[PDB]
Amino acid sequence: NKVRHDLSTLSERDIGSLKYALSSLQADTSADGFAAIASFHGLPAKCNDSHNNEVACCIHGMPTFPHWHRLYTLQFEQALRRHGSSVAVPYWDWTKPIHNIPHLFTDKEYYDVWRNKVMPNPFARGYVPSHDTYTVRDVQEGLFHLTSTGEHSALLNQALLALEQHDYCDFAVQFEVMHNTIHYLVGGPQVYSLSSLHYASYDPIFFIHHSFVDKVWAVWQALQEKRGLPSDRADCAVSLMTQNMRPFHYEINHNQFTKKHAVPNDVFKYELLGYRYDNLEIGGMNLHEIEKEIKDKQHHVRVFAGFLLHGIRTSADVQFQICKTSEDCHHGGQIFVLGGTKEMAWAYNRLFKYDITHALHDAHITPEDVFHPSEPFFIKVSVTAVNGTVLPASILHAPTIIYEPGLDHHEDHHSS
């Protein structure tokens, strides 16, 4: 029914359709409409029910999380289709370094038209009617990615690592974190922005970014197929899997396909959605190639940093540094987490690993050498809210230093 293309790939004609569709989307007062559609993600929280007790609708820090957002994108796509969008919503490939913020989203005014009328760009932003606030974005230039390889950006590295994981659960943990980065980048400090859990859904970038993440997640399933394991089946988070995903289950969403799809178990087969992607590729590697690419990574030994993510109450940035037994320390790396008060707290069942290895090497510190005197690796954590003071470390669990045996289950060739 539908193909998804990159934002850059979008032609003017294609974009023009999108431009109009969103405009009409905004107009749609109905529940299917954009204002209503946005609330599904977060505030206002309709999620448990309209009743006062409420939590954020979206599932985060949960394995259901990719399912929900995936479903969420379809809702918009269907909306646009109703609106007459010619194409599926595009995805903003974050992984590649961004010379500049995409024109379609960036331009505040959409001047081009046969009419040559000047209008606001629905893509640029939207406003929150309930809050009567307006969306805002504070972006860091740093997003323009610079890296040694150039190709391997932080997102690329993080995404790739997630990619190499048979375990879905393990995949999701890594998968979600990479996803988090964009919300932080665009939102910045702004309370009302992507950076905020409730507010974020309002920004139209949200759909674009999510399209990409969804695209990547889909690739993972395809990769899994390449691996030969069932893409559909999920080992853990079964409890979560069963639960129907509101508000999709609810009548509020007119969309029929979403309703049946509400169980996240069903969400896995994207094909049921009937939307496809122009190509399934991550950074130039084919699915086949990527599988090949990941195996080589396994050959090398790696050291990991383990994160136990309790979740922070306000959206928060965490910083990591590696310190020598002496005073010296290095910026190990940073990860972002997004969560509102509404978030209805979740915790990661498993450890979130980050590849310390590169940095340690920069340290000219081997995994063998001893980081701290008490236990071999003790590090000082730093956690900050997007705004506000630091959150207490004490609650947080101790750092884990991981050494990883490269051997998976891969033989160069079977016999014939």
Binding site: R233, A237, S239, N349, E375, F377, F378, I401, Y403
Partner: protein, 416 residues
């Protein structure tokens, strides 16, 4: 010199051996020294040594809800054992194999007084109980008779089942969670209602049964390591929580008047604790679970995995720790049936801890009786009660997940 002590089952002990224990413990109780019993009891709970003894916020000394947990306890038993040897007890601390069904409580612990033929003077069993100096109270024990042998059939026991599952986990961390909780059951069983007893975290150390139970628990851990050895994984090395293992555990670490034992102090590092025999010259007469041999056990374990199973997962905040939790599966339309129960030991004094991962319980058998399908939707109602009867608000507690662990089809391709 006979340095290597042997831990045997309590039942096994000859009267000569029993007599030695009776005498040794009695002397042990008397020992005023730090090495003495009262002082030793302090390590586990109140009085709380864990931040420096002269010091305000006093939280309990014991690693609970941590991977470190078996290491600390293992050290603790040795500490007691060494003390008895000083007393002149010939053997090692005996282990009460609770897993097996008990016709009755062991006579050694159970009877109030030992009338010994040595002279004929009738003396209260030091084994029976001890008194807490701190609180002017005596340890008490109230145990549910129900623990008495009532197998579904033969060997099958709740403990055996619970322990067995723990045994299956390859990774230590996963093993520990299952492992720890099973450990909790005995405390609850023996202590029962009384506020002063095995039931309470602070009190438990005082009861002499504590050592016997832990000896068994340590024994179980040892078998796990042997099983891991059989598995091919190095028993001593632990993949997870490498960092935590390095840090030493107090009070053993104090290595001062507080801890006389040199052995334990060196041993404080949990990494060291793994190789029990060399470091701690103690052994178990047999490392076996039930009738099964180690190789026997592994084979048996594989059998369980082969079949599909359903589990409920619990995230244990373990905040209102001393309490019993019982959960039952209730049909949508029909009856409820007791799913099973687990116990958490925790005094107010204990420091807060939370499980990184979920604890799994095998729901499957009960559902089968219900003839409930895995697919069918049932609701699990779980109630936690304090040791004293009372209802604790479950609402804050996160709902348990229900997970199905299927065999993947019958994977034709990987294995013939």
């Amino acid at each position: 010199p006979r340095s290597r002590l042997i831990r045997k089952n309590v039942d096994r002990l000859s009267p000569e051996e029993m007599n030695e224990l009776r005498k040794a413990l009695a002397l042990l109780k008397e020992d005023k020294s730090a090495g003495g019993f009262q002082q030793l009891g302090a390590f586990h709970g109140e009085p709380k040594w864990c931040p420096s003894p002269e010091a305000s916020k006093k939280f309990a000394c014991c690693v609970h809800g941590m991977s470190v947990f078996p290491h600390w306890h293992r050290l603790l038993t040795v500490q007691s054992e060494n003390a008895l040897r000083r007393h002149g007890y010939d053997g090692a601390l005996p282990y009460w194999d609770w897993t097996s069904p008990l016709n009755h409580l062991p006579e050694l612990a159970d009877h109030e007084k030992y009338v010994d033929p040595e002279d004929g003077v009738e003396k209260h069993n030091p084994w029976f109980d001890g008194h807490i100096d701190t609180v002017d109270k005596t340890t008490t024990r109230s145990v549910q008779n129900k623990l008495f042998e009532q197998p579904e059939f033969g060997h099958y026991t709740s403990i055996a089942k619970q322990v067995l599952l723990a045994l299956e986990q390859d990774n230590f961390c996963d093993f520990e969670i299952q492992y720890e909780i099973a450990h909790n059951y005995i405390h609850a069983l023996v202590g029962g209602a009384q506020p002063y007893g095995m039931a309470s975290l602070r009190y438990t150390a005082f009861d002499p049964l504590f050592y016997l139970h832990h000896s068994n628990t340590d024994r179980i851990w040892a078998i796990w390591q042997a099983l891991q050895k059989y598995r091919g994984k190095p028993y001593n090395v632990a993949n997870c929580a490498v960092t935590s293992m390095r840090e030493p555990l107090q009070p053993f670490g104090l290595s001062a008047n507080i801890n006389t034992d040199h052995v334990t102090k060196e041993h404080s590092v949990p990494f060291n604790v793994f190789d029990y025999k060399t470091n701690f010259n103690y052994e178990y007469d047999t490392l076996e679970f039930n009738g099964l041999s180690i190789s026997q056990l592994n084979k048996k374990l594989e059998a369980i995995k082969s079949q599909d199973r359903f589990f409920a997962g619990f995230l244990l905040s373990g905040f209102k720790k001393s309490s019993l939790v019982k959960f039952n599966i209730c049909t949508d339309s029909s009856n409820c049936h007791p799913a099973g129960e687990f116990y958490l030991l925790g005094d107010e004094n204990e420091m807060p801890w939370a499980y990184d991962r979920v604890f799994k319980y095998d729901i499957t058998e009960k559902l089968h009786d219900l003839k409930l399908h895995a697919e069918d939707h049932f609701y699990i109602d779980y109630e936690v009660f304090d040791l004293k009867p009372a209802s604790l608000g479950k609402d804050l507690f996160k709902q348990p997940s229900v997970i199905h662990e299927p065999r993947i089809g019958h994977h034709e391709g990987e294995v013939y």
